[PDB]
């Protein structure tokens, strides 16, 4: 992921 939010992590 990008690390930006849980769903993006």
């Amino acid at each position: 992921g990008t690390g930006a939010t849980p769903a993006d992590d």
Partner: antibody, heavy 113, light 113 residues
Framework: QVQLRQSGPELVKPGASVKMSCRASGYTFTNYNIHWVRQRPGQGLEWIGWIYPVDGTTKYNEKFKDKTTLTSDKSSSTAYMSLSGLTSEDSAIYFC??????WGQGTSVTVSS | DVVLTQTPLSLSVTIGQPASISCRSSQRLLYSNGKTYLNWFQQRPGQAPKYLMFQVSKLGPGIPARFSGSGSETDFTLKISRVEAEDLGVYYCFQGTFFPHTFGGGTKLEMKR
């Protein structure tokens, strides 16, 4: 060369709708969510929602849920946002973003008679 | 919803001098996995926001080391060790720990004269 290329400016009459596109390239489209963000003229940023291109799962800000539909087409690496039932409150630049790490250039919507 | 409060609204900076801006959260931002999803974005007017910092202190891709992030509980800080011309613009903090995700109101860095 990650790129999110958004469709052009839109002029919408009050009470109508708009559908805009976010064309992705330079990465594996199904490995990142596409978020959408609103910036009204002279204002800050508001998070609209995201879509996961693998399975079309979505998450919406409750504030935008009634007016907004997020879709995506894996085969064309393109995400879409439809906005329905607009007023001048919805005049804004709308950005898409790849997991928030790379943002499209924005699509302006002007809601006017 | 989480509300993020940024100070100052505007910061008059000088090339070569340090800068510091703050983001107060209305509640703690620790997620159940132990990570704190407080991020920073920089937007030059007329352009798209860029992913500057994530999870309080982790530099975004390609972001120079003159930027550093810190904080815990409800108070977070973004620092520039020495301001450069390209650092002018609007900086937004953002939280992704809770839905809906929310942005602070922005701090604009403008040139002192």
């Amino acid at each position: 060369q990650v790129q999110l290329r958004q469709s052009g400016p839109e002029l919408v009459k009050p009470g109508a709708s708009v559908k805009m596109s976010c064309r992705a390239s330079g990465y594996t489209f199904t490995n990142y969510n596409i978020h959408w963000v609103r910036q009204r003229p002279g204002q800050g940023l508001e998070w609209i929602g995201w879509i996961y291109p693998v399975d079309g799962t979505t998450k919406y800000n409750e504030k935008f849920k009634d007016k907004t539909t997020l879709t995506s087409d894996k085969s064309s690496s393109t995400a879409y946002m439809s906005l329905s039932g607009l007023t001048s409150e919805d005049s804004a630049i709308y950005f898409c973003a790849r997991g928030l790490d790379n943002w499209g250039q924005g699509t302006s919507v002007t809601v006017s008679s | 919803d989480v509300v993020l409060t940024q100070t100052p609204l505007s910061l008059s900076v000088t090339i070569g001098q340090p800068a510091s801006i703050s983001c107060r959260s209305s509640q703690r931002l620790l997620y159940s996995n132990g990570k704190t999803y407080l991020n920073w974005f920089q937007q030059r007017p007329g352009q798209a926001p860029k992913y500057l910092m994530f999870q309080v202190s982790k530099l975004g891709p390609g972001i120079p080391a003159r930027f550093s992030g810190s904080g815990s509980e409800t108070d977070f800080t973004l620092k520039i060790s020495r301001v450069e011309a390209e650092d002018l613009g609007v900086y937004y903090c953002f939280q992704g720990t809770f839905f809906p995700h929310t942005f602070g109101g922005g701090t604009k860095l403008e040139m002192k004269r």
